[PDB]
Amino acid sequence: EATPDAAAQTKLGITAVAPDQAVELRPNFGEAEVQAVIRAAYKQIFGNTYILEADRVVIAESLLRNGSISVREFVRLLAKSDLYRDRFFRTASNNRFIELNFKHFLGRAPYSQAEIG
Amino acid sequence: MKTVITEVIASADSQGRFLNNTELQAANGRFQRATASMEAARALTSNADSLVKGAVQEVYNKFPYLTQPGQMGYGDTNQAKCARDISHYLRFITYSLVAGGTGPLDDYIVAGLREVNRTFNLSPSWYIEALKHIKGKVGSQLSGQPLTEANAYIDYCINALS
Amino acid sequence: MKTVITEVIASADSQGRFLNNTELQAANGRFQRATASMEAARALTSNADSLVKGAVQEVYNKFPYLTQPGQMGYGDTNQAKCARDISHYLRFITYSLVAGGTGPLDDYIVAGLREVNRTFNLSPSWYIEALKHIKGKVGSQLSGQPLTEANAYIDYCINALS
Amino acid sequence: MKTVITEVIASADSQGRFLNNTELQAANGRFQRATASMEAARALTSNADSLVKGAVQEVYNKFPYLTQPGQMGYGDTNQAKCARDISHYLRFITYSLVAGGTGPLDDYIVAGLREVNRTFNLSPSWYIEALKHIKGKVGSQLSGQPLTEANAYIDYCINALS
Amino acid sequence: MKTVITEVIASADSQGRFLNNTELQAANGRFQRATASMEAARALTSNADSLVKGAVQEVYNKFPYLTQPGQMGYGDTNQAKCARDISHYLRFITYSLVAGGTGPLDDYIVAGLREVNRTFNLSPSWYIEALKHIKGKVGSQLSGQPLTEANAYIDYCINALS
Amino acid sequence: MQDAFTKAIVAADLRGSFLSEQELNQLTNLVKESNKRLDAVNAITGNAAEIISDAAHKLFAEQTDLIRPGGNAYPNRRMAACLRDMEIILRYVSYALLAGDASVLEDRCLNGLKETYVALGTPTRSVARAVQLMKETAIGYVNSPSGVTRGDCSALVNEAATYFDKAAASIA
Amino acid sequence: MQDAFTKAIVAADLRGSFLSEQELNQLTNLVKESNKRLDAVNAITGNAAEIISDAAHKLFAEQTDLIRPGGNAYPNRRMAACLRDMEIILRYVSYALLAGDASVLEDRCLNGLKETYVALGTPTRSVARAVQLMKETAIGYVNSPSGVTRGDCSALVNEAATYFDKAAASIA
Amino acid sequence: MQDAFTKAIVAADLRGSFLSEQELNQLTNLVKESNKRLDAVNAITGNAAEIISDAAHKLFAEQTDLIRPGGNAYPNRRMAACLRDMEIILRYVSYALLAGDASVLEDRCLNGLKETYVALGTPTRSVARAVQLMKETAIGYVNSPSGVTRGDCSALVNEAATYFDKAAASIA
Amino acid sequence: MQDAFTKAIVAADLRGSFLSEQELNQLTNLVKESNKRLDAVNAITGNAAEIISDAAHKLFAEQTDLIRPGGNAYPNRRMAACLRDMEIILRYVSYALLAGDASVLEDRCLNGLKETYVALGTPTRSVARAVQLMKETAIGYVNSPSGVTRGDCSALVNEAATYFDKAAASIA
Ligand SMILES: *[C@H](C)[C@H]1/C(=C/c2[nH]c(/C=C3N=C(/C=C4\NC(=O)C(CC)=C4C)C(C)=C\3CCC(=O)O)c(CCC(=O)O)c2C)NC(=O)[C@@H]1C
Ligand SMILES: *[C@H](C)[C@H]1/C(=C/c2[nH]c(/C=C3N=C(/C=C4\NC(=O)C(CC)=C4C)C(C)=C\3CCC(=O)O)c(CCC(=O)O)c2C)NC(=O)[C@@H]1C
Ligand SMILES: *[C@H](C)[C@H]1/C(=C/c2[nH]c(/C=C3N=C(/C=C4\NC(=O)C(CC)=C4C)C(C)=C\3CCC(=O)O)c(CCC(=O)O)c2C)NC(=O)[C@@H]1C
Ligand SMILES: *[C@H](C)[C@H]1/C(=C/c2[nH]c(/C=C3N=C(/C=C4\NC(=O)C(CC)=C4C)C(C)=C\3CCC(=O)O)c(CCC(=O)O)c2C)NC(=O)[C@@H]1C
Ligand SMILES: *[C@H](C)[C@H]1/C(=C/c2[nH]c(/C=C3N=C(/C=C4\NC(=O)C(CC)=C4C)C(C)=C\3CCC(=O)O)c(CCC(=O)O)c2C)NC(=O)[C@@H]1C
Ligand SMILES: *[C@H](C)[C@H]1/C(=C/c2[nH]c(/C=C3N=C(/C=C4\NC(=O)C(CC)=C4C)C(C)=C\3CCC(=O)O)c(CCC(=O)O)c2C)NC(=O)[C@@H]1C
Ligand SMILES: *[C@H](C)[C@H]1/C(=C/c2[nH]c(/C=C3N=C(/C=C4\NC(=O)C(CC)=C4C)C(C)=C\3CCC(=O)O)c(CCC(=O)O)c2C)NC(=O)[C@@H]1C
Ligand SMILES: *[C@H](C)[C@H]1/C(=C/c2[nH]c(/C=C3N=C(/C=C4\NC(=O)C(CC)=C4C)C(C)=C\3CCC(=O)O)c(CCC(=O)O)c2C)NC(=O)[C@@H]1C
Ligand SMILES: *[C@H](C)[C@H]1/C(=C/c2[nH]c(/C=C3N=C(/C=C4\NC(=O)C(CC)=C4C)C(C)=C\3CCC(=O)O)c(CCC(=O)O)c2C)NC(=O)[C@@H]1C
Ligand SMILES: *[C@H](C)[C@H]1/C(=C/c2[nH]c(/C=C3N=C(/C=C4\NC(=O)C(CC)=C4C)C(C)=C\3CCC(=O)O)c(CCC(=O)O)c2C)NC(=O)[C@@H]1C
Ligand SMILES: *[C@H](C)[C@H]1/C(=C/c2[nH]c(/C=C3N=C(/C=C4\NC(=O)C(CC)=C4C)C(C)=C\3CCC(=O)O)c(CCC(=O)O)c2C)NC(=O)[C@@H]1C
Residue A65: φ, ψ to 5°: -70, 140
Torsion angle in degrees (nearest 10) through CA of D19, D22, D27, D33: 180
| Separation between Cα atoms, residue F89 and residue F80, nearest integer Å | 15
Cα Rg of chain E, angstroms: 18
Helices (H), G63-75: none
Q: What is the 3-state secondary structure (H, E, C) of F61-73?
A: HHCHHHHCCCCCC
Handedness of CA F84, F85, F88, F94 (dihedral sign): negative
Is residue F159 within 8 A of residue F97, CB to CB? The reply is yes
For H17, other C-beta atoms within 10 Å of its C-beta total: 12
- Residue I14's nearest CA partner among B91, H121, G107, H45 is H121
- Residue B27's nearest CA partner among E72, E62, F38, G100 is F38
Domain range list for chain F: 1-172
Instruction: Among the bound ligands, name the one nearest to the CA of residue E75.
Output: 5
Is residue D141 within 8 A of residue D78, CB to CB? The reply is no
Q: Coil, strand or helix: which one is G122?
A: coil
Q: What's the angle, vertex CA G154, arms to CA G148 and CA G155, rounded to 5?
A: 110
* Residue C106 CB partners (closer than 8 Å, separation 6+): C1, C2
Half-sphere exposure of B13 (CA within 13 A, CB side): 28
| Separation between Cα atoms, residue C142 and residue A81, nearest integer Å | 42
- Residue I104's nearest CA partner among A26, H121, D106 is A26
For ligand 9, atom 20, name the residue with the nearest CA: H109
| Separation between Cα atoms, residue E23 and residue E4, nearest integer Å | 10
* Cis peptide bond prior to F69, omega within 30° of 0: no
Is residue G27 within 8 A of residue G136, CB to CB? The reply is no
| Separation between Cα atoms, residue F35 and residue H10, nearest integer Å | 32
For A24, other C-beta atoms within 10 Å of its C-beta total: 10
Ligand 3 atom closest to residue C116's alpha carbon, by position in its atom list: 24
| Separation between Cα atoms, residue B108 and residue F14, nearest integer Å | 12
Write b or e for each residue in F77-94: b if 16 or more Cβ atoms lie within 10 A of its Cβ, otherwise e: ebbeebbebbbebbbbbb
For I151, other C-beta atoms within 10 Å of its C-beta total: 9
Residue D65: φ, ψ to 5°: -55, -20
| Separation between Cα atoms, residue E24 and residue G45, nearest integer Å | 11
Q: How many residues does chain F have?
A: 172
CB within 8 Å: F1 and B9: yes
Domain range list for chain D: 1-162
CB-based contact (8 Å) between B77 and chain G? Answer: no
Q: How far is C144 from chain F (nearest CA, A)?
A: 7
| Separation between Cα atoms, residue B31 and residue F32, nearest integer Å | 9
Q: Coil, strand or helix: which one is G78?
A: helix
CA distance readout (Å), I106 to I2, I52, I110: 11, 20, 5
CA distance readout (Å), D7 to D26, D156, E7: 10, 19, 10
| Separation between Cα atoms, residue H73 and residue H60, nearest integer Å | 9
Q: How far apart are the first and last CA of chain H?
A: 24
Q: How far apart are the first and last CA of chain A?
A: 45
Write b or e for each residue in C43-70: b if 16 or more Cβ atoms lie within 10 A of its Cβ, otherwise e: bbbebbeebbebbbebbbeebeebbeee
* Residue F97 CB partners (closer than 8 Å, separation 6+): F37, F40, F41, F44, F156, F159, F160, F163
* Residue D40 CB partners (closer than 8 Å, separation 6+): D97, D142, D146, D147, D149, D150
Write b or e for each residue in E110-121: b if 16 or more Cβ atoms lie within 10 A of its Cβ, otherwise e: beebeeeeeeee
F172 touches ligand 6 (CB under 6 Å): no
Q: Which of D111, D119, D120 lies nearest to residue H77, judging by beta carbons?
A: D111
The nearest alpha carbon in chain A to H84 belongs to A58
Residue type, G7: K
Is residue F18 within 8 A of residue B45, CB to CB? The reply is yes
Residue H72: φ, ψ to 5°: -95, -20
| Separation between Cα atoms, residue D101 and residue E26, nearest integer Å | 10
The nearest alpha carbon in chain F to A94 belongs to F108
| Separation between Cα atoms, residue E37 and residue E101, nearest integer Å | 10
| Separation between Cα atoms, residue E94 and residue E146, nearest integer Å | 12
Is residue C51 within 8 A of residue C44, CB to CB? The reply is yes
Resolution in A: 3.0
CA distance readout (Å), B95 to A33, B138, C2, C67: 43, 16, 31, 64
Is residue G79 within 8 A of residue B120, CB to CB? The reply is no
| Separation between Cα atoms, residue C37 and residue H99, nearest integer Å | 19
B149 phi-psi bin (left φ>0, alpha ψ -120 to 50, beta other): alpha
Instruction: Among the bound ligands, name the one nearest to the CA of residue E161.
Output: 5
DSSP-derived letter for residue D109 is: I
| Separation between Cα atoms, residue A36 and residue B125, nearest integer Å | 33
Q: What is the distance in A from the centroid of ligand 4 to the CA of H79?
A: 11
Q: What's the angle, vertex CA E73, arms to CA E72 and CA E75, rounded to 5?
A: 95
* Residue G22 CB partners (closer than 8 Å, separation 6+): none
Q: What is the 3-state secondary structure (H, E, C) of chain H?
A: CCCHHHHHHHHHHHHCCCCCHHHHHHHHHHHHHHHHHHHHHHHHHHHHHHHHHHHHHHHHHHCHHHHCCCCCCCCHHHHHHHHHHHHHHHHHHHHHHHHCCCHHHHHHHHCCHHHHHHHHCCCHHHHHHHHHHHHHHHHHHHHCCCCCCCCCCHHHHHHHHHHHHHHHHHHC
Fold (CATH) for F1-172: Globin-like (1.10.490)
The yes or no reply on domain C1-162 and CATH 1.10.490.20 is yes
> Which class for H118: exposed (0-12), middle (13-18), buried (19 or more C-beta within 10 A)?
exposed
Write b or e for each residue in G120-139: b if 16 or more Cβ atoms lie within 10 A of its Cβ, otherwise e: eebbeebbbbbbbbbbebbb
Q: Coil, strand or helix: which one is E149?
A: helix
Residue type, G93: V
For every residue of chain A, DSSP letters joined together read ----TTHHHHTTT-TTTSS-------SS--HHHHHHHHHHHHHHTS-SS---GGGS-HHHHHHHTTTSS-HHHHHHHHHSSHHHHHTGGGTS-HHHHHHHHHHHTBSSPP--HHHH-
The nearest alpha carbon in chain C to B153 belongs to C21
Handedness of CA I37, I38, I39, I45 (dihedral sign): positive
| Separation between Cα atoms, residue C52 and residue C118, nearest integer Å | 23
Q: How far is H28 from chain B (nearest CA, A)?
A: 18
| Separation between Cα atoms, residue B9 and residue E120, nearest integer Å | 64
Q: Coil, strand or helix: which one is G14?
A: helix
For ligand 4, atom 35, name the residue with the nearest CA: H57
Measured from CB, residues less than 6 Å from any atom of ligand 9 are A 59, 62-63, 65-66; H 66, 72-73, 78, 81-82, 85-86, 88, 109, 113, 116, 120, 122-123, 126-127, 130
CB-based contact (8 Å) between G130 and chain B? Answer: no
Q: How far apart are the first and last CA of chain E?
A: 22
Is residue H67 within 8 A of residue H60, CB to CB? The reply is yes
F170 touches ligand 6 (CB under 6 Å): no
| Separation between Cα atoms, residue C86 and residue I39, nearest integer Å | 85
Is residue B44 within 8 A of residue B150, CB to CB? The reply is yes
Helices (H), G16-153: 21-62, 76-99, 103-104, 113-120, 124-142
- Residue E157's nearest CA partner among E93, E63, E81 is E93
> Which class for A102: exposed (0-12), middle (13-18), buried (19 or more C-beta within 10 A)?
middle
Is residue I40 within 8 A of residue I163, CB to CB? The reply is no
Is residue C95 within 8 A of residue H19, CB to CB? The reply is yes
| Separation between Cα atoms, residue E138 and residue H42, nearest integer Å | 81
Is residue H69 within 8 A of residue H76, CB to CB? The reply is no
Which residues of G are less than 8 Å from A87 in CB distance?
none
CA distance readout (Å), D71 to C102, D60, D102, D114, G111: 56, 12, 34, 21, 51
| Separation between Cα atoms, residue C27 and residue H33, nearest integer Å | 13
Q: Coil, strand or helix: which one is D59?
A: helix
* Residue A9 CB partners (closer than 8 Å, separation 6+): A15, A18
- Residue I96's nearest CA partner among I156, I150, I29 is I156
Q: What is the distance in A from the centroid of ligand 2 to the CA of I44?
A: 61
Torsion angle in degrees (nearest 10) through CA of I133, I137, I142, I148: 180
Q: How many residues does chain E have?
A: 162
C151 touches ligand 7 (CB under 6 Å): no
Q: What is the distance in A from the centroid of ligand 6 to the CA of I70?
A: 58
Q: How far apart are the first and last CA of chain B?
A: 23
| Separation between Cα atoms, residue B128 and residue B158, nearest integer Å | 6
CA distance readout (Å), E89 to C125, E2, E37, E147: 81, 17, 17, 17
**Displacement of CA A11 from its chain's centroid (Å):** 24
| Separation between Cα atoms, residue E127 and residue E161, nearest integer Å | 8
Is residue B95 within 8 A of residue F9, CB to CB? The reply is yes
* Residue I110 CB partners (closer than 8 Å, separation 6+): I92, I166, I167, I170, I171
* Residue F68 CB partners (closer than 8 Å, separation 6+): F74
Q: Coil, strand or helix: which one is C10?
A: helix
Q: Which long-range contacts (CB under 8 A, 24 or more apart) does C81-87 make?
A: C82/C56, C82/C126, C83/C52, C83/C56, C85/C127, C86/C52, C86/C55, C86/C56, C86/C127, C86/C130, C87/C48, C87/C52
CA distance readout (Å), I151 to F70, I47, I154: 89, 21, 9
Residue type, C6: T
Residue type, E149: E
Q: What is the distance in A from the centroid of ligand 4 to the CA of H67?
A: 10
* Residue B100 CB partners (closer than 8 Å, separation 6+): B3, B4, B5, B30, B33, B34, B37, C22, C25, F5
Is residue I145 within 8 A of residue I151, CB to CB? The reply is no
